[PDB]
């Protein structure tokens, strides 16, 4: 049930248009019974723990669910960029593991070198009641990200795959952007 973006004028995924802005379970995901929807102007990913998408290690993110913006219909020039950052939102401080594989027309895949984790102690309470952590993926963590960001001949991200793991059946991603 992924839904195309209605407004991507910010140049990054802010999920403020009520859509999953192209995101949904990836065809090659080992896990599929994961819910991906828009809630509270964010990308809400439910049941990660119940479906075994809870690997929190650095190199076994292969066991986690893979999501991708297959019906995104947009793109982002990332030449010269060095980071992929996003806010992880949850009602209580949880643990979330994220590995990413940005894709371009000529650089379709690269095995992530490592997944980046934010642990409970990384979450800060928000006045809205929820807790939020800032997760950042460097080009050092994703070779395909480094390849695209350093390839002036083809530095346009046309899609992306995220490996998402958590010990919480309720987390949200928001403001996923390259900088
Ligand atoms: O073709 C246009 C279409 O492409 C979509 O992207 C595809 C990639 O093109 C495709 O290469 C990629 O395939 C992955 C596959 O999903 C992985 O599961 C698999 O992983 C391998 C790993 O590479 C090996 O090193 C390791 O030893 O084993 C694992 C599995 O055992 O690797 C292949 C790549 O070789 O899948 C993408 C989609 O999931 C774009 O997303 C889309 O936008 C384009 O339209
Ligand atoms: Ca938002």
PDB file of C-alpha atoms and ligand atoms in Angstrom:
ATOM      1  CA  UNK A   1       0.000   0.000   0.000  1.00  0.00           C
ATOM      2  CA  UNK A   2       2.802   2.495  -0.729  1.00  0.00           C
ATOM      3  CA  UNK A   3       1.585   5.879  -2.000  1.00  0.00           C
ATOM      4  CA  UNK A   4       3.316   8.301  -4.375  1.00  0.00           C
ATOM      5  CA  UNK A   5       4.262  11.748  -3.072  1.00  0.00           C
ATOM      6  CA  UNK A   6       1.808  14.596  -3.490  1.00  0.00           C
ATOM      7  CA  UNK A   7       4.486  17.153  -2.630  1.00  0.00           C
ATOM      8  CA  UNK A   8       8.245  16.659  -2.639  1.00  0.00           C
ATOM      9  CA  UNK A   9       9.103  20.357  -3.066  1.00  0.00           C
ATOM     10  CA  UNK A  10      11.350  20.280   0.012  1.00  0.00           C
ATOM     11  CA  UNK A  11      13.816  18.076  -1.854  1.00  0.00           C
ATOM     12  CA  UNK A  12      13.696  15.313   0.752  1.00  0.00           C
ATOM     13  CA  UNK A  13      11.270  12.935   2.449  1.00  0.00           C
ATOM     14  CA  UNK A  14       9.279  14.961   5.010  1.00  0.00           C
ATOM     15  CA  UNK A  15       6.161  12.833   4.711  1.00  0.00           C
ATOM     16  CA  UNK A  16       3.963  15.880   5.320  1.00  0.00           C
ATOM     17  CA  UNK A  17       1.655  15.213   2.354  1.00  0.00           C
ATOM     18  CA  UNK A  18      -0.069  12.206   3.895  1.00  0.00           C
ATOM     19  CA  UNK A  19       1.715   9.706   1.633  1.00  0.00           C
ATOM     20  CA  UNK A  20       4.563   7.231   2.183  1.00  0.00           C
ATOM     21  CA  UNK A  21       6.203   9.372  -0.501  1.00  0.00           C
ATOM     22  CA  UNK A  22       6.929   6.302  -2.574  1.00  0.00           C
ATOM     23  CA  UNK A  23       8.061   4.004   0.250  1.00  0.00           C
ATOM     24  CA  UNK A  24       6.955   0.417   0.718  1.00  0.00           C
ATOM     25  CA  UNK A  25       8.321  -3.060   1.385  1.00  0.00           C
ATOM     26  CA  UNK A  26      11.100  -4.016  -1.041  1.00  0.00           C
ATOM     27  CA  UNK A  27      10.478  -7.064  -3.275  1.00  0.00           C
ATOM     28  CA  UNK A  28      13.723  -8.641  -2.073  1.00  0.00           C
ATOM     29  CA  UNK A  29      12.964  -8.177   1.625  1.00  0.00           C
ATOM     30  CA  UNK A  30      13.234 -11.349   3.710  1.00  0.00           C
ATOM     31  CA  UNK A  31      10.315  -9.978   5.739  1.00  0.00           C
ATOM     32  CA  UNK A  32       7.057  -8.626   4.318  1.00  0.00           C
ATOM     33  CA  UNK A  33       4.370  -8.509   7.011  1.00  0.00           C
ATOM     34  CA  UNK A  34       5.600  -5.050   8.062  1.00  0.00           C
ATOM     35  CA  UNK A  35       3.175  -2.129   7.899  1.00  0.00           C
ATOM     36  CA  UNK A  36       4.408   1.028   6.151  1.00  0.00           C
ATOM     37  CA  UNK A  37       2.125   4.058   6.308  1.00  0.00           C
ATOM     38  CA  UNK A  38       1.938   7.799   6.924  1.00  0.00           C
ATOM     39  CA  UNK A  39       0.978   8.841  10.437  1.00  0.00           C
ATOM     40  CA  UNK A  40       1.438  12.163  12.215  1.00  0.00           C
ATOM     41  CA  UNK A  41       3.222  13.492   9.137  1.00  0.00           C
ATOM     42  CA  UNK A  42       5.842  10.761   9.279  1.00  0.00           C
ATOM     43  CA  UNK A  43       6.606   7.306   7.914  1.00  0.00           C
ATOM     44  CA  UNK A  44       5.218   4.847  10.480  1.00  0.00           C
ATOM     45  CA  UNK A  45       6.754   1.349  10.366  1.00  0.00           C
ATOM     46  CA  UNK A  46       4.863  -1.137  12.563  1.00  0.00           C
ATOM     47  CA  UNK A  47       5.443  -4.692  13.798  1.00  0.00           C
ATOM     48  CA  UNK A  48       9.186  -4.812  13.139  1.00  0.00           C
ATOM     49  CA  UNK A  49       9.877  -6.801  16.293  1.00  0.00           C
ATOM     50  CA  UNK A  50       6.954  -9.228  15.929  1.00  0.00           C
ATOM     51  CA  UNK A  51       8.036 -10.196  12.401  1.00  0.00           C
ATOM     52  CA  UNK A  52      11.655 -10.762  13.281  1.00  0.00           C
ATOM     53  CA  UNK A  53      12.953  -7.543  11.781  1.00  0.00           C
ATOM     54  CA  UNK A  54      14.902  -6.834  14.943  1.00  0.00           C
ATOM     55  CA  UNK A  55      18.573  -7.264  14.082  1.00  0.00           C
ATOM     56  CA  UNK A  56      20.478  -4.504  15.867  1.00  0.00           C
ATOM     57  CA  UNK A  57      24.015  -5.619  15.037  1.00  0.00           C
ATOM     58  CA  UNK A  58      26.404  -3.777  12.753  1.00  0.00           C
ATOM     59  CA  UNK A  59      26.734  -6.338   9.990  1.00  0.00           C
ATOM     60  CA  UNK A  60      23.685  -8.620  10.185  1.00  0.00           C
ATOM     61  CA  UNK A  61      21.180  -5.992   9.018  1.00  0.00           C
ATOM     62  CA  UNK A  62      20.609  -8.502   6.211  1.00  0.00           C
ATOM     63  CA  UNK A  63      18.019 -10.104   8.479  1.00  0.00           C
ATOM     64  CA  UNK A  64      15.927  -6.952   8.610  1.00  0.00           C
ATOM     65  CA  UNK A  65      13.049  -5.757   6.464  1.00  0.00           C
ATOM     66  CA  UNK A  66      14.013  -3.763   3.360  1.00  0.00           C
ATOM     67  CA  UNK A  67      11.862  -0.808   2.279  1.00  0.00           C
ATOM     68  CA  UNK A  68      12.269   1.220  -0.894  1.00  0.00           C
ATOM     69  CA  UNK A  69      10.641   4.189  -2.587  1.00  0.00           C
ATOM     70  CA  UNK A  70       9.532   2.269  -5.675  1.00  0.00           C
ATOM     71  CA  UNK A  71       6.745   4.693  -6.647  1.00  0.00           C
ATOM     72  CA  UNK A  72       8.664   7.800  -5.563  1.00  0.00           C
ATOM     73  CA  UNK A  73       8.721   9.242  -9.088  1.00  0.00           C
ATOM     74  CA  UNK A  74      11.283  11.909  -8.071  1.00  0.00           C
ATOM     75  CA  UNK A  75      15.051  12.269  -7.643  1.00  0.00           C
ATOM     76  CA  UNK A  76      17.806  13.964  -5.669  1.00  0.00           C
ATOM     77  CA  UNK A  77      21.222  15.092  -6.901  1.00  0.00           C
ATOM     78  CA  UNK A  78      23.635  14.087  -4.144  1.00  0.00           C
ATOM     79  CA  UNK A  79      26.973  14.862  -5.778  1.00  0.00           C
ATOM     80  CA  UNK A  80      29.309  16.071  -3.053  1.00  0.00           C
ATOM     81  CA  UNK A  81      26.967  14.999  -0.268  1.00  0.00           C
ATOM     82  CA  UNK A  82      28.391  13.044   2.643  1.00  0.00           C
ATOM     83  CA  UNK A  83      25.456  12.193   4.907  1.00  0.00           C
ATOM     84  CA  UNK A  84      21.998  10.619   4.963  1.00  0.00           C
ATOM     85  CA  UNK A  85      20.198  11.796   8.094  1.00  0.00           C
ATOM     86  CA  UNK A  86      16.753  11.155   9.522  1.00  0.00           C
ATOM     87  CA  UNK A  87      14.794  11.477  12.745  1.00  0.00           C
ATOM     88  CA  UNK A  88      13.681   8.272  14.394  1.00  0.00           C
ATOM     89  CA  UNK A  89      10.467   8.755  16.346  1.00  0.00           C
ATOM     90  CA  UNK A  90       8.985   6.392  18.939  1.00  0.00           C
ATOM     91  CA  UNK A  91       6.716   6.691  22.015  1.00  0.00           C
ATOM     92  CA  UNK A  92       9.449   5.294  24.272  1.00  0.00           C
ATOM     93  CA  UNK A  93      13.229   5.236  23.817  1.00  0.00           C
ATOM     94  CA  UNK A  94      13.863   2.217  21.553  1.00  0.00           C
ATOM     95  CA  UNK A  95      16.669   0.693  19.536  1.00  0.00           C
ATOM     96  CA  UNK A  96      16.640   1.045  15.775  1.00  0.00           C
ATOM     97  CA  UNK A  97      19.122  -0.207  13.190  1.00  0.00           C
ATOM     98  CA  UNK A  98      19.336   1.388   9.746  1.00  0.00           C
ATOM     99  CA  UNK A  99      21.487   0.550   6.709  1.00  0.00           C
ATOM    100  CA  UNK A 100      20.922   2.306   3.408  1.00  0.00           C
ATOM    101  CA  UNK A 101      21.580   1.800  -0.255  1.00  0.00           C
ATOM    102  CA  UNK A 102      20.898   4.869  -2.376  1.00  0.00           C
ATOM    103  CA  UNK A 103      20.458   3.948  -6.045  1.00  0.00           C
ATOM    104  CA  UNK A 104      21.157   5.799  -9.312  1.00  0.00           C
ATOM    105  CA  UNK A 105      20.430   4.741 -12.895  1.00  0.00           C
ATOM    106  CA  UNK A 106      23.950   3.332 -13.327  1.00  0.00           C
ATOM    107  CA  UNK A 107      24.770   2.381  -9.705  1.00  0.00           C
ATOM    108  CA  UNK A 108      22.012  -0.009  -8.690  1.00  0.00           C
ATOM    109  CA  UNK A 109      23.612  -1.797  -5.746  1.00  0.00           C
ATOM    110  CA  UNK A 110      26.341  -1.911  -3.145  1.00  0.00           C
ATOM    111  CA  UNK A 111      26.450  -4.025  -0.011  1.00  0.00           C
ATOM    112  CA  UNK A 112      26.251  -1.715   3.031  1.00  0.00           C
ATOM    113  CA  UNK A 113      29.438  -1.828   5.078  1.00  0.00           C
ATOM    114  CA  UNK A 114      27.487  -1.397   8.301  1.00  0.00           C
ATOM    115  CA  UNK A 115      24.158  -0.501   9.873  1.00  0.00           C
ATOM    116  CA  UNK A 116      23.952   2.595  12.064  1.00  0.00           C
ATOM    117  CA  UNK A 117      22.261   2.156  15.438  1.00  0.00           C
ATOM    118  CA  UNK A 118      20.612   4.591  17.814  1.00  0.00           C
ATOM    119  CA  UNK A 119      20.003   3.124  21.263  1.00  0.00           C
ATOM    120  CA  UNK A 120      17.599   4.171  24.015  1.00  0.00           C
ATOM    121  CA  UNK A 121      20.155   6.566  25.514  1.00  0.00           C
ATOM    122  CA  UNK A 122      20.258   8.341  22.141  1.00  0.00           C
ATOM    123  CA  UNK A 123      16.602   9.422  22.371  1.00  0.00           C
ATOM    124  CA  UNK A 124      15.528  12.813  23.728  1.00  0.00           C
ATOM    125  CA  UNK A 125      12.014  13.426  25.061  1.00  0.00           C
ATOM    126  CA  UNK A 126       9.846  15.772  22.983  1.00  0.00           C
ATOM    127  CA  UNK A 127       7.226  18.241  24.231  1.00  0.00           C
ATOM    128  CA  UNK A 128       4.692  16.380  22.087  1.00  0.00           C
ATOM    129  CA  UNK A 129       5.252  13.455  24.438  1.00  0.00           C
ATOM    130  CA  UNK A 130       7.167  11.189  22.038  1.00  0.00           C
ATOM    131  CA  UNK A 131      10.912  10.529  21.972  1.00  0.00           C
ATOM    132  CA  UNK A 132      13.234  11.235  19.070  1.00  0.00           C
ATOM    133  CA  UNK A 133      16.725  10.243  17.977  1.00  0.00           C
ATOM    134  CA  UNK A 134      18.872  11.500  15.130  1.00  0.00           C
ATOM    135  CA  UNK A 135      20.338   8.744  12.974  1.00  0.00           C
ATOM    136  CA  UNK A 136      23.046   9.563  10.428  1.00  0.00           C
ATOM    137  CA  UNK A 137      24.441   7.346   7.696  1.00  0.00           C
ATOM    138  CA  UNK A 138      27.811   8.339   6.236  1.00  0.00           C
ATOM    139  CA  UNK A 139      29.154   7.446   2.802  1.00  0.00           C
ATOM    140  CA  UNK A 140      31.686   5.371   4.744  1.00  0.00           C
ATOM    141  CA  UNK A 141      28.766   3.128   5.730  1.00  0.00           C
ATOM    142  CA  UNK A 142      27.321   2.585   2.243  1.00  0.00           C
ATOM    143  CA  UNK A 143      29.656   2.032  -0.723  1.00  0.00           C
ATOM    144  CA  UNK A 144      26.898   2.679  -3.285  1.00  0.00           C
ATOM    145  CA  UNK A 145      26.189   5.955  -1.483  1.00  0.00           C
ATOM    146  CA  UNK A 146      29.876   6.858  -1.788  1.00  0.00           C
ATOM    147  CA  UNK A 147      29.932   5.797  -5.445  1.00  0.00           C
ATOM    148  CA  UNK A 148      26.918   7.934  -6.414  1.00  0.00           C
ATOM    149  CA  UNK A 149      28.033  10.944  -4.313  1.00  0.00           C
ATOM    150  CA  UNK A 150      31.465  10.913  -5.951  1.00  0.00           C
ATOM    151  CA  UNK A 151      30.342  10.169  -9.509  1.00  0.00           C
ATOM    152  CA  UNK A 152      29.697  13.506 -11.219  1.00  0.00           C
ATOM    153  CA  UNK A 153      28.695  11.572 -14.335  1.00  0.00           C
ATOM    154  CA  UNK A 154      25.714  10.091 -12.464  1.00  0.00           C
ATOM    155  CA  UNK A 155      25.080  11.540  -9.022  1.00  0.00           C
ATOM    156  CA  UNK A 156      21.275  11.464  -9.106  1.00  0.00           C
ATOM    157  CA  UNK A 157      19.545   9.248  -6.562  1.00  0.00           C
ATOM    158  CA  UNK A 158      16.541   7.707  -8.365  1.00  0.00           C
ATOM    159  CA  UNK A 159      15.560   5.362  -5.513  1.00  0.00           C
ATOM    160  CA  UNK A 160      16.796   4.007  -2.204  1.00  0.00           C
ATOM    161  CA  UNK A 161      16.620   0.871  -0.091  1.00  0.00           C
ATOM    162  CA  UNK A 162      16.526   0.993   3.685  1.00  0.00           C
ATOM    163  CA  UNK A 163      17.177  -2.003   5.927  1.00  0.00           C
ATOM    164  CA  UNK A 164      15.089  -1.317   9.048  1.00  0.00           C
ATOM    165  CA  UNK A 165      15.391  -3.186  12.333  1.00  0.00           C
ATOM    166  CA  UNK A 166      14.029  -2.499  15.829  1.00  0.00           C
ATOM    167  CA  UNK A 167      12.996  -4.097  19.136  1.00  0.00           C
ATOM    168  CA  UNK A 168       9.841  -1.960  19.022  1.00  0.00           C
ATOM    169  CA  UNK A 169       6.651  -2.759  17.099  1.00  0.00           C
ATOM    170  CA  UNK A 170       6.199   1.021  16.605  1.00  0.00           C
ATOM    171  CA  UNK A 171       8.721   3.479  15.219  1.00  0.00           C
ATOM    172  CA  UNK A 172       8.582   6.297  12.677  1.00  0.00           C
ATOM    173  CA  UNK A 173      11.054   7.822  10.265  1.00  0.00           C
ATOM    174  CA  UNK A 174      10.898  11.455   9.246  1.00  0.00           C
ATOM    175  CA  UNK A 175      12.988  14.051   7.444  1.00  0.00           C
ATOM    176  CA  UNK A 176      15.153  11.542   5.565  1.00  0.00           C
ATOM    177  CA  UNK A 177      17.517  13.804   3.586  1.00  0.00           C
ATOM    178  CA  UNK A 178      21.013  13.894   2.081  1.00  0.00           C
ATOM    179  CA  UNK A 179      23.395  16.664   3.221  1.00  0.00           C
TER     180      UNK A 179
HETATM  181  O1  LIG B   1      16.513  -2.422 -12.810  1.00  0.00           O
HETATM  182  C1  LIG B   1      15.873  -1.197 -12.495  1.00  0.00           C
HETATM  183  C2  LIG B   1      15.284  -1.221 -11.095  1.00  0.00           C
HETATM  184  O2  LIG B   1      16.345  -1.688 -10.207  1.00  0.00           O
HETATM  185  C3  LIG B   1      15.983  -1.622  -8.802  1.00  0.00           C
HETATM  186  O3  LIG B   1      17.077  -2.016  -8.039  1.00  0.00           O
HETATM  187  C4  LIG B   1      17.436  -3.399  -7.930  1.00  0.00           C
HETATM  188  C5  LIG B   1      18.898  -3.563  -8.394  1.00  0.00           C
HETATM  189  O4  LIG B   1      19.023  -3.279  -9.785  1.00  0.00           O
HETATM  190  C6  LIG B   1      19.364  -4.981  -8.129  1.00  0.00           C
HETATM  191  O5  LIG B   1      20.738  -5.121  -8.461  1.00  0.00           O
HETATM  192  C7  LIG B   1      19.196  -5.315  -6.669  1.00  0.00           C
HETATM  193  O6  LIG B   1      19.529  -6.635  -6.528  1.00  0.00           O
HETATM  194  C8  LIG B   1      20.222  -7.013  -5.350  1.00  0.00           C
HETATM  195  C9  LIG B   1      19.287  -7.838  -4.490  1.00  0.00           C
HETATM  196  O7  LIG B   1      18.144  -7.066  -4.132  1.00  0.00           O
HETATM  197  C10 LIG B   1      20.042  -8.270  -3.256  1.00  0.00           C
HETATM  198  O8  LIG B   1      19.205  -9.101  -2.465  1.00  0.00           O
HETATM  199  C11 LIG B   1      21.302  -9.051  -3.642  1.00  0.00           C
HETATM  200  O9  LIG B   1      22.071  -9.193  -2.501  1.00  0.00           O
HETATM  201  C12 LIG B   1      23.207 -10.078  -2.588  1.00  0.00           C
HETATM  202  C13 LIG B   1      24.496  -9.271  -2.421  1.00  0.00           C
HETATM  203  O10 LIG B   1      24.605  -8.327  -3.467  1.00  0.00           O
HETATM  204  C14 LIG B   1      25.687 -10.201  -2.477  1.00  0.00           C
HETATM  205  O11 LIG B   1      26.914  -9.464  -2.349  1.00  0.00           O
HETATM  206  C15 LIG B   1      25.547 -11.218  -1.344  1.00  0.00           C
HETATM  207  O12 LIG B   1      26.570 -12.144  -1.453  1.00  0.00           O
HETATM  208  O13 LIG B   1      24.300 -11.944  -1.492  1.00  0.00           O
HETATM  209  C16 LIG B   1      23.135 -11.082  -1.461  1.00  0.00           C
HETATM  210  C17 LIG B   1      21.909 -11.982  -1.529  1.00  0.00           C
HETATM  211  O14 LIG B   1      22.249 -13.320  -1.176  1.00  0.00           O
HETATM  212  O15 LIG B   1      22.113  -8.342  -4.599  1.00  0.00           O
HETATM  213  C18 LIG B   1      21.408  -7.851  -5.759  1.00  0.00           C
HETATM  214  C19 LIG B   1      22.390  -6.998  -6.537  1.00  0.00           C
HETATM  215  O16 LIG B   1      23.428  -7.798  -7.082  1.00  0.00           O
HETATM  216  O17 LIG B   1      17.823  -5.165  -6.272  1.00  0.00           O
HETATM  217  C20 LIG B   1      17.328  -3.820  -6.459  1.00  0.00           C
HETATM  218  C21 LIG B   1      15.909  -3.786  -5.912  1.00  0.00           C
HETATM  219  O18 LIG B   1      15.824  -4.504  -4.684  1.00  0.00           O
HETATM  220  C22 LIG B   1      15.671  -0.179  -8.427  1.00  0.00           C
HETATM  221  O19 LIG B   1      15.322  -0.119  -7.054  1.00  0.00           O
HETATM  222  C23 LIG B   1      14.523   0.345  -9.257  1.00  0.00           C
HETATM  223  O20 LIG B   1      14.326   1.716  -8.954  1.00  0.00           O
HETATM  224  C24 LIG B   1      14.846   0.202 -10.740  1.00  0.00           C
HETATM  225  O21 LIG B   1      13.701   0.559 -11.506  1.00  0.00           O
HETATM  226 CA1  LIG B   2       7.240  15.094   8.757  1.00  0.00          CA
END
